[PDB]
């Protein structure tokens, strides 16, 4: 009899962590940091709903393809949702210059206010109502983009247009016009009389003469003619003037950029649901509680950081061991109010008291190390949506290499952080147990025999009063020194 | 007499590793991970040979400059080899719009099948044979690109061309045509009669009128006229139609894109050799066995990862120490079946038995740590070839900064990994030796005297039977306890 | 009496370092590595002054807007300083094609030599003096760009111009011309007679017909006409020829690129001062001594590496503890010639001698670890200035994401390096103290009692002669063995 042991926590847990050295090492306590689930819905962003384009494309919406709903209310939006291949684009076929730049401008835009600038009924000198085509049905009749006017000769005359708009607003105006490319010479005269036409646009920044390119082309949604659209931003106190002798597709409405800020054009097939998040991905939404996730790289909002991994587990507590009679042999399921502690074994004592002078000091630096690593990735790379046309392959791939490039880097960083500080977390516990022992060993010196398993046996009488002497760094050799010098002489001369 | 020592491996090796702390530290065992050699040849890629353009440029090949060999067999290729400054490009001088994009499309292309679409002999209404020039010799005569036709007025007439090709294939067609820019008004009429011409191309995606730009230019390979080429991809079930009144350089053959996949345009001066690899660089080929290399950044195939370093050496074993009588003093050349072990010294014994209960457990986590680091760079940045024209300097440099940017990062990563896990590999060995000792010390307690060099001297009689008691965690104090309590009393009272 | 203690340095220092584990840990010795100050001036770069554009823009300078000073001396420059929004650009309004590419070419250019190529007085057939406008005042009169000529019909005639320059220099020539876009048909005839004009330019690389685009535009600095400029580099032994029938803005002077090399276009509002640096930022200059700084990302010269941090402190020495009687309790302010050492306490001795066999060996690997980390970031990402026009937003943001992307990475790297090697630096010190103890313990074995605080008490007589026996790894048990075996028997049998 008359013993004392130094040991560590153990418990029912089976959570598993990894290090540089070892795979799958069971631990008392561990915290997962990788979000891997999503809700498959398309939610609003902290109260603010997305602009859902339905089966339409940004060009369809802006130009007002008869198939796409105007947004009469002038709403703000948190992001824009476009299908992967929308069906309602340029219903009348053609091209839309610097389209992918316009889309990129939408990503920093949060609210438009549509405003009339040239009212459709103000083109006295031309036919403002025959410009419709079979390619643009609204309710089965022939129609046309709501937001632009296809001007056509009135009375076999086409008087040269010169018209101007002064932008008297505080905001930037986004303005869109177009020019018509007929398929033969006979049709050019049929529509605009003058055989040779142009479309001129002037602002202080932009000067452009546009000319009708007549070619023989396949049928797209029915026609072989084409229509090419342009666009520009008109700054406040600047004016724009158009002049043409034909082929001019004039704007009726402009778009007040009224709210800039964080936004995005997400490509997704989903539709809206009565729901809200702090983090949206194209395939659903994320419970942004954990610091990392692997659901999708193109997440927007207040999001955890994306890493290409399948799990990522911090270690916070000991390894998990029975495990009897001191630390050399494992940990004590019977310790519960700490991680490292002791075991009494006295004339009166039972055992199992914890040294939270070093257990709090360890839960101290552990949960302080824990989100100091979470915060050291606050600067991590968050990817951003961009699009490129068929003649921009090189930089599309430059952009791809760049975004995958950083994601691989930050993934490497994330993993190496966990593996390394895992190994240092466990290496800490051991040294903590191992110093508990020593704090006892350098108190009880002569008066006890090191038993080689992690316990000491007393060359004196202990009492419970004094077994707090050793826990508290209190025990003093002299007051039990003589009683021990006695008995060790007697084992020396025992049986 | 009556001793036992705890010591470690040492041997003839002189391999040197580095850490954060120290340079050039000799070790028992080490493994190099940096490939630094190449074979200076240009080999096939795992059975599949490269398309070697010889003295020609991608434009020369595609257009079929009379100097460049057609590839009649329609071969597939693993990569494309272009000289740094080929001599057979546009032999007739001009430009080739979105050339560097076309080159980039080749990088994802593995096989072409050339196919006739407008047979040279089907232009009844024009002269299909006078379009040759002194700038394009084949066998010293005047000639011209094999794959396009220089159409010229037949009989002082040039009837307006309108011709169409429906792409009835499953594959994408790559199609190339051109327009002629004469040097004076008199020559334009000399060749095409009509003073004012155009070249119109239509597909469902592309609409383009092209117009002859007459200027006065220097002589390039003899001429002052110019020729500008265009190109487009015609998707299946789409058609293309050309129409012109002159200056039209019509396609004869199109290129079926038949195999897409991994490929590349390597710039190299070398030529092919009877040889094969899994990794090709522009300056030769690589024995892809090791995980890193430093031969060249633009390597293709199944390649080790490029890092800008001169050596990179993993440490796997101990430091390298004579080194006599226990671990405090160095390692034992005489231990051979392990890394850590013991030394007998008995009434019968010699010494030098290894504790492979902790030597296998160390060769365990070492070669497991070894390629866990190799695999943690499986996601590393691999650079990709791209080209940019003289007006694309900014993004050419963006691309350069990006690729050097990641290579510096990954090089830093690679080195810090080795240095750090080197320091933890050696720090492991020491703690392994140092725990061998303790496993012995906590067995033999009273019955032996710690000699301070790493050995114990027995206060009892040992025998070989029992010196496996201490190796095997077997030795039990009581069965030799009385014989020791005897003698230590007698040194206490000896001489 | 008769003692000896093992302890460590401590001193007046209050410098604070951080690790993964703990914040704000005081240390004996530490070195700051983050430059955070600048001088707010704009200095020369190692003797070589910047080209200060004052209120002008690169286009103003090159074209020689009457408001911008020519640089008659043909100076070289280390960098170029442009205000954020200069006031002297195209005073005559228009555009300047591939402007941001030209600016990028300046960044690799260090010296121009302006040279006449078409002397203003050599246009016999046209009016070379009426081309001035109210938009370009010099000293209040009407004027025009010094470096180009606005050619205007002489005598209601405009004979077709064809003029050529052979570049007979070793250097690349930078050449700039322009074309005039009038506001109405009547003005085009007023200035150039011929109603329909063109501007043709030929080199071996460039072929271009330019055509006057007449539109109705707002007034910029007074006018509604516009002027569009072009530019090209003419390589040596190549020639260029222009021809026009009107609207031609002809070059007078060209720019010999005479010195290429490292340079930059810094945007800054500052002006020059009598001052020099090795590192310039847009907001001032940097004492490039430390390895990292956080003043500004766009620093040029021989600069420390930019990291987005507020402090970065290496730990080099111990923690900072009174701290009495051995290492278990703290460090000794009284040790001064080392970091770890001893304390005598003898029949004659006082104490406090240092073991610089392990103190030099620690100042060894510490200052070797110190700039091995500084040198492991020698490859770090240095950002580079680039500009993009309003239709290049996507790649402008690609470039921004890329540069912030690497800066976040390298900042993470920098911090993790310090935190981790800080923790290993302190963890070293402790193990160094802790091995000092042991080197003593395994010498003095039986002959001393471990006192549990870090000191030993001698079972024999020591003398100063022998207390170097223990410092020097010299002390040998036998020569004091008998005197100790005596007294320990007497404590066993003492009071
Ligand atoms: C602008 C114009 O001419 N519109 C006309 C269209 C188009 O010509 C075709 O759809 C080809 O564009 O043809 C109509 O019969 C129709 O579809 O109602 C009459 C209409 O006025
Ligand atoms: C298309 C054409 O006109 N080809 C003719 C060429 C070219 O005119 C010159 O090489 C300048 O292009 O001149 C020839 O004497 C020749 O070289 O055989 C006759 C030939 O028919
Ligand atoms: C090239 C030209 O015509 N220059 C003339 C200018 C410009 O016409 C206007 O500034 C509009 O460009 O007008 C003047 O009265 C002037 O300002 O001295 C005469 C001068 O010769």
């Amino acid at each position: 009899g008359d013993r004392i042991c130094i040991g560590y926590h153990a418990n029912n847990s089976t959570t598993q962590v990894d290090t540089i050295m070892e795979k799958n090492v069971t631990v008392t306590h561990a915290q997962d940091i990788l979000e891997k689930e999503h809700n498959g819905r398309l939610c609003s962003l902290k109260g603010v709903k997305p602009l859902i384009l339905k089966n339409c494309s940004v060009a369809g919406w802006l130009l007002g393809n008869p198939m796409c709903d105007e947004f009469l209310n002038a709403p703000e939006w948190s992001y824009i949702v476009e299908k992967d291949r929308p069906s309602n684009g340029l219903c009348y076929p053609g091209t839309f210059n610097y389209y992918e730049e316009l889309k990129h401008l939408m990503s920093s835009t949060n609210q438009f206010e549509k405003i009339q600038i040239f009212p459709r009924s103000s083109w006295s000198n031309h036919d403002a109502s025959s410009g419709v085509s079979s390619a643009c049905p609204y309710n089965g009749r022939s129609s046309f983009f709501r937001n632009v006017v296809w001007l056509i000769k009135k009375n076999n005359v086409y008087r040269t247009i010169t018209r101007t708009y002064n932008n008297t607003n505080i905001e930037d105006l986004l303005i869109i016009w177009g020019i018509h490319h007929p398929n033969n010479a006979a049709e050019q005269i049929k529509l605009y009389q003058n055989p040779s036409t142009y479309v001129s646009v002037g602002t202080s920044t932009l000067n452009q003469r546009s000319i009708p390119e007549i070619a023989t082309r396949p049928k797209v949604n029915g026609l072989s003619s084409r229509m090419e659209f342009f666009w520009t931003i008109l700054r406040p106190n600047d004016s724009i003037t158009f002049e043409s002798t034909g082929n001019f597709i004039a704007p009726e409405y402009a778009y007040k950029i009224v709210k800039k800020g964080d936004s995005a054009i997400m490509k997704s097939e989903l539709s809206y649901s009565n729901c809200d998040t702090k983090c949206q991905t194209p395939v659903g939404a994320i419970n942004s509680s954990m610091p990392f996730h692997n659901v999708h790289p193109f997440a927007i909002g207040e999001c955890p950081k994306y890493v290409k991994l399948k799990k990522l587990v911090l270690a916070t507590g000991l390894r998990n061991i029975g495990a009897i009679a001191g630390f050399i042999e494992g940990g004590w399921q019977g310790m519960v109010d700490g991680w490292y502690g002791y075991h009494h074994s006295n004339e009166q004592g039972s055992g199992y008291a914890a040294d939270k002078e070093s257990t709090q000091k360890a839960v101290d630096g552990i949960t302080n190390k824990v989100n100091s690593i979470i915060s050291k990735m606050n600067s991590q790379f968050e990817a951003v949506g961009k699009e490129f046309n068929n003649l921009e392959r090189r930089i599309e791939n430059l952009n791809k290499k760049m975004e995958d490039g950083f994601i691989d880097v930050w993934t490497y960083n994330a993993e190496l952080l966990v593996l390394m500080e895992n190994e240092r977390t466990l290496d800490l516990h051991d040294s903590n147990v191992k110093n508990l022992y020593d704090k006892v060993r350098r108190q009880l010196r002569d008066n006890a025999k090191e038993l080689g398993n992690g316990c000491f046996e007393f060359y004196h009488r202990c009492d419970n009063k004094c077994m707090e002497s050793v826990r508290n760094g209190t025990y003093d050799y002299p007051q039990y020194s003589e009683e021990s010098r006695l008995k060790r002489e007697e084992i020396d001369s025992g049986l």
Side-chain angles (χ1 to χ4, degrees), chain A:
Chain A
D2 258 357
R3 284 188 154 149
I4 200 178
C5 301
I6 283 60
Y8 54 89
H9 201 76
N11 59 29
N12 41 15
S13 156
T14 190
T15 50
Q16 298 224 48
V17 305
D18 301 345
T19 57
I20 322 93
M21 205 74 76
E22 333 173 7
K23 313 296 149 209
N24 292 119
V25 317
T26 305
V27 302
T28 86
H29 299 354
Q31 193 23 52
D32 185 20
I33 58 160
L34 185 64
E35 192 73 68
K36 322 181 204 49
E37 289 302 328
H38 70 85
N39 79 351
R41 297 154 66 128
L42 204 79
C43 308
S44 62
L45 253 187
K46 291 168 76 100
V48 176
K49 320 208 278 191
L51 191 62
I52 307 279
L53 287 191
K54 294 185 175 147
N55 274 325
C56 291
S57 77
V58 172
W61 164 46
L62 282 205
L63 284 158
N65 174 326
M67 287 302 261
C68 308
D69 290 300
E70 46 219 78
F71 289 90
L72 291 319
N73 295 347
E76 77 183 278
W77 61 83
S78 40
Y79 58 98
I80 293 202
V81 172
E82 204 193 40
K83 272 172 167 41
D84 202 294
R85 308 191 56 201
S87 52
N88 294 318
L90 306 178
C91 47
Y92 205 107
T95 73
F96 195 127
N97 289 89
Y98 297 93
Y99 182 53
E100 288 78 18
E101 283 281 309
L102 182 49
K103 270 153 137 280
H104 182 69
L105 176 66
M106 309 299 306
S107 323
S108 174
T109 312
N110 292 112
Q111 203 181 12
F112 279 166
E113 203 183 292
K114 197 200 266 176
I115 81 156
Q116 206 177 43
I117 66 186
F118 302 143
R120 180 171 311 249
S121 61
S122 61
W123 304 101
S124 322
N125 306 356
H126 312 75
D127 182 345
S129 47
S130 308
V132 304
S133 160
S134 49
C136 320
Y138 180 19
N139 269 332
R141 298 168 49 190
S142 274
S143 188
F144 200 59
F145 307 108
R146 296 177 322 263
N147 299 322
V148 293
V149 193
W150 183 358
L151 293 182
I152 277 188
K153 83 203 198 179
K154 156 149 293 154
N155 207 56
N156 294 307
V157 86
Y158 190 120
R159 220 195 102 178
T160 296
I161 297 172
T162 280
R163 201 149 152 176
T164 297
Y165 175 97
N166 314 270
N167 173 25
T168 50
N169 308 260
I170 164 176
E171 308 94 0
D172 286 341
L173 268 194
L174 172 130
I175 298 178
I176 301 184
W177 70 103
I179 187 182
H180 187 225
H181 299 305
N183 45 68
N184 70 30
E187 163 181 5
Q188 147 79 22
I189 288 88
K190 188 287 204 193
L191 300 165
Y192 319 103
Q193 208 48 79
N194 313 345
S196 210
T197 53
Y198 64 104
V199 190
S200 62
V201 165
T203 75
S204 40
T205 321
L206 151 66
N207 167 34
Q208 144 173 325
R209 200 107 157 164
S210 269
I211 214 83
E213 292 182 355
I214 285 174
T216 288
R217 338 193 168 68
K219 275 52 183 169
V220 189
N221 308 125
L223 318 99
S224 154
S225 46
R226 296 278 184 281
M227 284 217 315
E228 187 189 356
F229 296 83
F230 315 116
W231 68 272
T232 182
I233 306 281
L234 182 64
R235 297 214 274 262
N237 267 289
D238 198 1
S239 98
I240 192 181
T241 77
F242 306 77
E243 97 166 346
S244 273
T245 58
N247 308 69
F248 177 39
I249 312 299
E252 164 163 32
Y253 300 103
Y255 281 116
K256 281 212 266 166
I257 303 156
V258 307
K259 194 157 181 318
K260 314 189 190 164
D262 299 338
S263 169
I265 300 179
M266 203 185 274
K267 309 281 243 160
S268 161
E269 306 304 303
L270 306 186
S271 211
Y272 183 76
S273 323
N274 281 345
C275 171
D276 181 70
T277 42
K278 26 173 165 71
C279 187
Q280 187 66 54
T281 86
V283 311
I286 293 182
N287 255 348
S288 174
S289 100
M290 271 182 298
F292 296 99
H293 78 83
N294 66 351
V295 167
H296 199 290
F298 283 117
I300 79 196
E302 279 107 291
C303 287
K305 304 301 199 158
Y306 174 72
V307 290
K308 277 194 282 235
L309 297 180
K310 324 217 182 267
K311 73 221 174 272
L312 194 59
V313 202
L314 276 190
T316 36
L318 291 298
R319 298 192 181 183
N320 238 23
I321 60 184
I324 306 148
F327 81 86
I328 299 293
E329 307 258 90
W332 298 330
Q333 304 93 312
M335 199 150 48
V336 165
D337 68 278
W339 277 339
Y340 332 116
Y342 313 83
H343 180 77
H344 292 36
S345 291
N346 203 349
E347 280 228 2
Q348 56 270 52
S350 55
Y352 288 151
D355 192 300
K356 277 225 75 148
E357 184 203 356
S358 51
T359 300
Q360 195 177 90
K361 178 167 257 186
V363 73
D364 267 3
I366 263 57
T367 62
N368 263 345
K369 195 214 287 273
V370 156
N371 34 40
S372 72
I373 67 103
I374 293 170
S375 82
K376 266 321 301 178
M377 336 278 298
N378 82 333
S379 62
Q380 180 157 137
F381 180 89
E382 273 156 340
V384 153
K386 302 207 213 328
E387 289 196 65
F388 315 84
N389 69 41
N390 51 94
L391 273 185
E392 301 181 304
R393 278 332 166 209
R394 286 172 301 147
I395 58 131
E396 169 178 351
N397 182 69
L398 181 68
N399 177 250
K400 207 231 309 165
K401 278 265 166 320
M402 203 219 53
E403 300 212 285
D404 297 337
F406 287 109
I407 295 171
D408 293 330
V409 159
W410 283 112
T411 291
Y412 176 92
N413 284 358
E415 201 169 352
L416 269 300
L417 201 62
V418 176
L419 291 183
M420 287 199 355
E421 281 321 315
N422 279 352
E423 184 100 275
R424 264 211 172 286
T425 283
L426 303 185
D427 267 15
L428 176 87
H429 287 324
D430 295 342
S431 91
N432 271 10
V433 159
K434 288 219 70 87
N435 278 163
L436 210 42
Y437 193 87
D438 281 344
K439 188 190 96 150
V440 169
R441 150 163 144 148
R442 37 186 50 111
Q443 298 196 96
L444 318 191
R445 329 199 264 121
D446 262 321
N447 316 327
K449 164 142 209 45
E450 294 199 34
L451 309 157
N453 65 343
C455 309
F456 313 79
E457 211 178 77
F458 290 85
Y459 288 167
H460 71 234
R461 279 179 215 168
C462 214
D463 191 44
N464 279 9
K465 160 270 188 48
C466 164
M467 293 245 279
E468 211 168 334
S469 273
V470 48
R471 321 213 293 286
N472 298 188
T474 297
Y475 178 92
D476 293 344
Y477 181 80
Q479 181 230 325
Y480 314 75
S481 78
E482 254 292 337
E483 172 181 11
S484 313
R485 75 89 189 219
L486 282 184
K487 307 220 219 153
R488 67 162 139 288
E489 290 280 348
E490 305 171 87
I491 289 82
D492 271 15
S493 313
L495 162 56

